[PDB]
Amino acid sequence: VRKQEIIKVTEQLIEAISNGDFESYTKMCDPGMTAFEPEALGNLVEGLDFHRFYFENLWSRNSKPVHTTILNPHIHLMGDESACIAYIRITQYLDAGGIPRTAQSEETRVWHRRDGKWQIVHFHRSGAPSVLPH
Amino acid sequence: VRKQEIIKVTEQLIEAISNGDFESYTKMCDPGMTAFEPEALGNLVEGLDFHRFYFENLWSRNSKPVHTTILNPHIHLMGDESACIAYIRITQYLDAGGIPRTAQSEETRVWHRRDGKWQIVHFHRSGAPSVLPH
Amino acid sequence: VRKQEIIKVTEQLIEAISNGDFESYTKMCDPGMTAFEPEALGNLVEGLDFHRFYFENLWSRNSKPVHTTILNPHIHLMGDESACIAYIRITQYLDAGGIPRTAQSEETRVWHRRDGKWQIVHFHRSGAPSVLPH
Amino acid sequence: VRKQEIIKVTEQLIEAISNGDFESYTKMCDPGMTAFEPEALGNLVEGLDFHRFYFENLWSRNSKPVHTTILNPHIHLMGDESACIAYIRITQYLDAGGIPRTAQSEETRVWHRRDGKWQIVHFHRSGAPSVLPH
Amino acid sequence: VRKQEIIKVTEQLIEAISNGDFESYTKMCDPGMTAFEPEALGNLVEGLDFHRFYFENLWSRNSKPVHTTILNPHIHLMGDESACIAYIRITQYLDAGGIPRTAQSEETRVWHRRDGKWQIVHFHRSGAPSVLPH
Amino acid sequence: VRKQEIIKVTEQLIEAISNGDFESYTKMCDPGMTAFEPEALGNLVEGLDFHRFYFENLWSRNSKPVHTTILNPHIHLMGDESACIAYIRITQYLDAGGIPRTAQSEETRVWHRRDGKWQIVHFHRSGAPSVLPH
Amino acid sequence: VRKQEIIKVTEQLIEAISNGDFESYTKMCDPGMTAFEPEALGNLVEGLDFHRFYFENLWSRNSKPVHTTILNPHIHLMGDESACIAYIRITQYLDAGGIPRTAQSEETRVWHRRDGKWQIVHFHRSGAPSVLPH
Amino acid sequence: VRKQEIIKVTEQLIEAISNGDFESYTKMCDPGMTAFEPEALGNLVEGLDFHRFYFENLWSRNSKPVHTTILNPHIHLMGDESACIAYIRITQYLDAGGIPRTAQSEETRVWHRRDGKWQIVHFHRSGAPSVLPH
Amino acid sequence: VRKQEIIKVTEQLIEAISNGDFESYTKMCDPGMTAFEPEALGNLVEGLDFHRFYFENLWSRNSKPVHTTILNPHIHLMGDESACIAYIRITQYLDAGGIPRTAQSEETRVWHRRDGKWQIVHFHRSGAPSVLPH
Amino acid sequence: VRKQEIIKVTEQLIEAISNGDFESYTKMCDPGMTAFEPEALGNLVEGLDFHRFYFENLWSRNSKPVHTTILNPHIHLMGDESACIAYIRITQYLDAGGIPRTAQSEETRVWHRRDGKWQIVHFHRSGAPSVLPH
Amino acid sequence: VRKQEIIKVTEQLIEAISNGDFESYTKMCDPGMTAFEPEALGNLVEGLDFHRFYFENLWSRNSKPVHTTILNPHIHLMGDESACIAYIRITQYLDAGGIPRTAQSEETRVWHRRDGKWQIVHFHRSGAPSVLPH
Amino acid sequence: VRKQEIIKVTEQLIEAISNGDFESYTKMCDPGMTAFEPEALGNLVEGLDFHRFYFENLWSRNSKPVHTTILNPHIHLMGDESACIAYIRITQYLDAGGIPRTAQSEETRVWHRRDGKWQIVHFHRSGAPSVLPH
Amino acid sequence: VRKQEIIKVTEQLIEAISNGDFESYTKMCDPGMTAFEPEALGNLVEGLDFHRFYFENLWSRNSKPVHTTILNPHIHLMGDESACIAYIRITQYLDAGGIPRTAQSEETRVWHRRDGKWQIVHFHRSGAPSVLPH
Amino acid sequence: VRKQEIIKVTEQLIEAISNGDFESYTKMCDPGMTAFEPEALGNLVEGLDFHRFYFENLWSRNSKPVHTTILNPHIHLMGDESACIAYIRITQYLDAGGIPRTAQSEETRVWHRRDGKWQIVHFHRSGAPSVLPH
């Protein structure tokens, strides 16, 4: 039972990023959230304003065909408040010539249930950048 | 107070890996532990036998000078059972010519307190491989 | 006799992919079907939605001249329910300049007769990508 | 229950190849077995004499440290006689300088139970060659 | 005397290919004819449908200036039914800029007299592709 | 029946070349035999003295492990006197470091039965040189 | 308390440069200010006229989207008159194709409180040039 | 007068580093000292243990000929407690072949007079690494 | 005296080729004439139809400025019927941009006086192709 | 009949060069003989002293295995005194590692019968240098 | 006092070159003036006509934004008639895309006071050419 | 005195070439004049028709700005009839983009006074081609 | 007369550097002497201690054959106290293999007669480094 | 008659250089002789001391096999005192591996008969350096 709720909230977050829905994304993140990812050049960023730039300059503007597969999700439940999920992410997208391409990333998300709502406190991404290559 | 215990157990684990102490490392890991790192080629590994190969073929054999700095540790406490730590790791080492070199990695470790003992349930590494370049 | 039916259903499937007929392709695949191929970046995919992207963005749209040769089909029959076919596939196609090109792949398909109908349960491709190079 | 027997016989075969035990390997293969793999240059080979060359010139001679991980095995059972297994294979080995390296392959094996004994009738490999790179 | 008839029928076939006359080419080939050539990627093709693609997409459409020289034809007569011819082929053609170019191939053709008519049963080409380079 | 004799005499010839047995090779060739192959630089050679150089400087001297596979032999019988065989040839050999390698060639041989004995009148090779690469 | 005023005046200066406000920048700099940065080719520049060129030819003209993050500011207070700040600077900007990019620099600023107003007496920059790459 | 004391203590520190005198270097640094330099990979380091590695593995061991020139020192005095110095540094050294080479760096040092003794609170280096290139 | 007639007829032939006068060129060549030159790819051509292609596709069409110098002609007279001439040829021409270029070739021509008229029986060219480079 | 004498004297000359027999070579050349070949850098040489250097520094010293094939000799007879021969030359030789190699050249020789003896008055070579590549 | 007059006349000359004022430049140069600079290809030029070409083809025509900094001028006074000045020159300019660039040169000027007027008798430039790179 | 006349006639000749005045150039050259220069590909040319091509296709057509400097002329007088001059030549010219460029050549001219008029009998050029590079 | 004394003292200085005679070099330099040269990386050095390193590590140790030519010395005399000399310098030397090499530099030296003795106050070098290349 | 004496004295000089006979070379040169050649880097040298370095470090020491051909000497006689010779020079030599090589240069020599003896007043060389390449 309880592992399916961590998959559900993770798929909802990946959908909100894909739509460019920064309002829904802001409800799902902790305000003190930290991140490691390729765009931050090896630094640990904190809060949502680093991410807001990609929403305002890509995700809110973009309307191209994109598809995401979550492969082999492994979930750790750590009492009733706390969870971790690790998965491989495959992205299919059309390039600047309109040709299909595939990208892979490795992703970790750490979730805490605050006031009865699940929120991300940390995430780590490796492999392909979130800004897709052309 | 409680954030210092997560720093302590993380430094003890980094020391056990550096010494090649697979017995102490086995006490600090959960048997169901998962990992993402450069040596696994983008796959999620599970359990300790993938790591045992680097202990038996490098860390247990090695006696060269190496130094580690943990930069900017950020810690999330998620109730009394559960914690996450994220940091930048700098490694100083001598190359095959005896010349000093520096490497950087980005690291996340997820800790759960099981039967009163802290253990790693998941980790994620990016940047430099653990097998240092020459 | 029975080896010719495995050749027949394999040629019908290659024709449905070539036409972009995702409805006919969906009748010939098991819903739990797995695949290895160049577009999946070394991962094992499951179900039909990874493939649906190439139907919707290429095969359903495409009208260029293409020809396929099946070379040296070897067939194993494993009782009355189960079969395997292995072959070399040659594809002739026109490039973006309108010049003829040739590509080669190596293909395995595993068939099970469910409710009296043959369906693919697994496939593996090597060599040329299915998205043809220009 | 029955999926564990396909994992067992697959691990026993990978062990016999790793030991250079061509006698045990010959008991586990069908005499009419076919294969696709990187060493055959894109051709379909048949019978055991192509493989005998790597046993006699490497596997029977070799004594270096090597470790294998089978990741995410997916199994199809197709009546009581017939089975297919698909997995990712990770190999850890020491290079010519004595440094640890990792390789990945994608593997399919098709099994038939003949006279009460499981035997391979076909296999397909992609990614890293079986002769490990240095 | 009899060697001149093998030269005659060989020059008539090279003319029919050059004109894009697939009807005349089909009269001169055996329906079971095999071939080795650069376009088949190192495979042995059988029958006429692999060749039909180059007639329909180039030879039937093309009207550029092209000239062919047969150099040093050597002929073996093997009773009254059977003959082999081996020669060097030089092709002069205009490139995409309208500049003259030269290409060389090495060619073997095996002829059998069936029902009083000479037909090709096998051919082998090396050197320049039949689709001329630009 | 009669196709097996063309396979037999072809395997005996490949064995005589592999042993460096120029006496047995001279019995199997016509004295007027012609050839196309990579070592002749695109020229048609005639008689046995071009080949004698590789017997005297390699095949008669060599004792390294080598294995040959004949893949997919296609045979044309052209009355009772005359035959043609076409096949793919795979060669496994050890390099100068003692590492296994694989090479591929495409081969045609034309046979005539003179005084009741089969002899080669022409041959054509493509792909890998007969002098194996290191 | 007092470290927050050094962060405030540093963020105000970074804002004035980003706006192209050379009048506000001139109020915040000492007239005898020195600098090390990538644009000065390894030389120590003095006064404001070297910087005036980038205001007049870029910052006063530019209206593209740009965002700045100050990471890990460390501050030394050296009596009541004098302060030093060191930080990592991340810049997000759109390239000439309109694609998001990230740059990193390392920055030191030395502040003196003259007539009750904080002013920069020296600065040093490393990493990315201030003129952003495209 | 007072600018000459900042030159004096800066030359004494450069001499202590050149000798490998970590005891004298430890007297001249603040225990909370921060640094930016090429060996730290773009990170801000704090305290003396990162630097101790180059003393123990190079400067304490080294006895080769080296010469240093300080070019164009500019000094800011900021009350009686606090000073900043900026200069270009030229290093002459013999390479691994015994040939003279030259390197350049740009350096800033921030000094505070604590308990009547001048100590470094921050430093920033650019250009050549401190570990000299060969 | 007699050496000047071999120079005369050689200059007349070079003029006829330069004009694209295939009728005059056909009067000066023997019908059985052989040639070695760069366009024939290392083969010996015979008769005039290989050369006719360059007359019909370049020399008859071309009207650009071209100049030829014959340097150091050496002549052998071999009785009253037979002569050989060897010379260096310099060609000045305008490229596709209208810029002057120079090319060099080495040329041999063998002349026989048949029915009182001098005709070329063989020629050999080296260096620059006759189709000038751009 | 008479064409066989031009082949004979040409094979005798190629043998004398291969042996390093400069005395026999001097009997077969005219003292006024001219040559074009790769070693003369595009110049026309005259007399025997340019060639004497390769006899004295290679051909007289050399004892390695070498074999020569004359392919497709074409001969022009020009009265009773004068002849020309043109052929392709294939050379088989062992390299510095002892591995067989092949080279090709194109050759013309002009012969005059002086005092009843055939002598070379001119020669022209193209393709491979006479000093064989390693 | 007297060093400021050498700075003044040097800045006036750099201004006259920047304006393309060849009349003012001619008043400031000796008619026998010599120069070393990158445009003269390592030669010593004499008089003003080599320089006149850059005035007439660039400096008199140019109207782009350019800025010059003189860094660290060192002056030698050698009696009342004679002076030398040495400095580093930084040039800021816009490229062909309108992007700011920086160049560095090293400059020496030798001045003599003739009839009460300072004039250049020699100059030497190194580093960046005077014709700025794009 | 007499050395100035050799400079005068040399400058007049360089002017006539620069103007494209082939009539004046023809008065200043001996009809038997020889030359070495980069355009002749290492050959010695004789007479004026090789040079006429550059007059007719460049110098007579050209109107771009060009300037020539003669550096360090050394003159040998060899009785009253004969002189030699050697100098370095610098050419300033505008490229195809309108940017100033510089070229260098080394030049020798040999003069003979025939019927009271100085004429060139030989010249030699090295370095830059006379056809200026773009 | 007076120009020969500037040549004399310049040749004596070049000799003292070539011998490694730092005592004689110190007598000929002003203690406040400045320099521009390739070894100083584009900086202006002052005094003799930068140069002392090349005396102590090369010139005092070296005994290889070296020869220097001064080409085209131009001298300006600026009253009775002051002189400037400009020349091209050619250096011939043996490389690490013992092969002759040539290098070129452009040099300026400024001389002042202090207390009746000529001394260098400034020098500038371009082209080849003083540390000769191998 | 008189042209043969210029060939004689030119061959004697080439022999004296080849022997390393600097005494004989000094008798044949004018003391004021000038030269252009590849070793002088595009400068005009004067007198014999530049050349003395190659005699003392190569020609006097060397004993390897070398051969020289003078091709196509053209001679101008300019009264009874003065002559010019121009020729192509071919050099055959053994490389560092003992393999024959060929080099080409273009050479001009200007001769004056002083006190009844011919002496070189100027020479110019192009193409291959005199120090032969390996």
Residue numbers in the entry:
A (entry chain A), B (entry chain N), C (entry chain C), D (entry chain M), E (entry chain D), F (entry chain L), ...: 345 to 478
Reproduce, without paraphrasing, sentences from the article in which this PDB structure was first reported.
The calcium calmodulin protein kinase II (CaMKII) is a multi-subunit ring assembly with a central hub formed by the association domains. The AD hub, which evolved from bacterial dimeric enzymes, extends the β sheet to form lateral contact interfaces (LCs) needed for ring assembly, while the ancient dimer contact was preserved as the vertical contact interface (VC) in the mirror-symmetric two-stack hub. Here, we present near-atomic resolution cryogenic electron microscopy (cryo-EM) structures revealing that hubs from the α and β isoforms, either standalone or within an β holoenzyme, coexist as 12 and 14 subunit assemblies.
We expressed and purified a recombinant form of CaMKII comprising the α AD fused to a fluorescent Venus tag, separated by a flexible 15-amino-acid linker. From a single sample, we obtained two cryo-EM structures for the CaMKIIα hub, a dodecamer (12-mer) and a tetradecamer (14-mer), with 6 and 7 ADs in each of the two stacked rings, respectively. The 12-mer and 14-mer hubs were resolved to 2.7 and 2.6 Å, respectively. The overlay between the cryo-EM map and the atomic model for a single AD from the 14-mer α hub, shows a well-resolved backbone, except for two loops plus the N- and C-termini. The average Q-score for secondary structure elements, 0.73 for α-helices and 0.85 for β-sheets are higher than that for loops (0.66). The sequences from the structures were aligned, and the residues conserved across the mammalian isoforms were mapped onto our 14-mer cryo-EM α hub to show the dielectric variations in the contact interfaces. The root mean square fluctuation (RMSF) values showed that the VC is more rigid than the LC in the tetramer extracted from the α 14-mer (α14T), consistent with the ePISA estimates of the energetics. The superimposed structures of the 12-mers between α-isoform and β-isoform had a root mean square deviation (RMSD) of 0.35 Å, while that for the comparison of the 14-mers between the two isoforms is 0.3 Å.
